[PDB]
């Protein structure tokens, strides 16, 4: 369940990429330029030590390994992050130290609980009663506001559930802001 590839790896192949049984993968101390978007295959990935690399820009598909709970991105070349990453709510540790990020991102991350504050901001800005973040992740913060889903509640009051929409994307996470 845990792979650690060492010896200054330039570029990764696609056989890696095929071992779904992996629940963790480490790529520290290598010469990686970028991460093929094909990393999504390894859905059991919970831990990803992409530290000590030369990654200039992370793949946008990265932010779909929901099971991923610890992600190490220090010692790199990332100038910003893909906003899609905010999807990953089970993430427990977000290591961003040593990256030339903008000041606004660094301000949100330096706060107490800056990992969750940064992920909530990204998800609230991702392009599209009770019920809180800490239990409902999938609904962004602006969508869990009671005013937003009251709008859609009222529309259904006046008014074919094809799962096709949620296969590749899997927008399986419920009240996704259309759903109240």
């Amino acid at each position: 369940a845990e792979l650690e590839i060492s010896g200054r790896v330039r570029s990764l192949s696609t056989s890696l990429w095929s071992l779904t049984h992996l629940t963790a993968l480490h790529l520290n101390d290598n010469y990686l330029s970028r991460i093929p978007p094909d990393i999504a295959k390894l859905h059991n990935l919970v831990y990803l030590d992409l530290s000590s690399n030369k990654l200039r820009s992370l793949p946008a598909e990265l932010g779909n390994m929901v099971s991923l709970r610890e992600l190490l991105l220090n010692n790199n070349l990332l100038r910003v992050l893909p906003y899609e990453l905010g999807r990953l709510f089970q993430l427990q540790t977000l290591g961003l130290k040593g990256n030339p990020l903008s000041q606004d991102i660094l301000n949100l991350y330096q706060d107490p609980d800056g990992t969750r504050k940064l992920l909530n901001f990204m998800l609230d800005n991702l392009a599209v009663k009770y019920a809180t973040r800490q239990l409902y992740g999938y609904c962004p913060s602006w969508a869990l506001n009671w005013e937003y889903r009251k709008k859609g509640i009222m529309e259904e009051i006046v008014n074919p559930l094809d799962p096709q929409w949620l296969v590749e994307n899997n927008i399986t996470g419920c009240p996704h802001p259309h759903i109240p």
Partner: peptide
């Protein structure tokens, strides 16, 4: 190209 990875668990 030598060896690049230790296996696992």
């Amino acid at each position: 190209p030598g060896v690049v990875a230790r296996p696992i668990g």
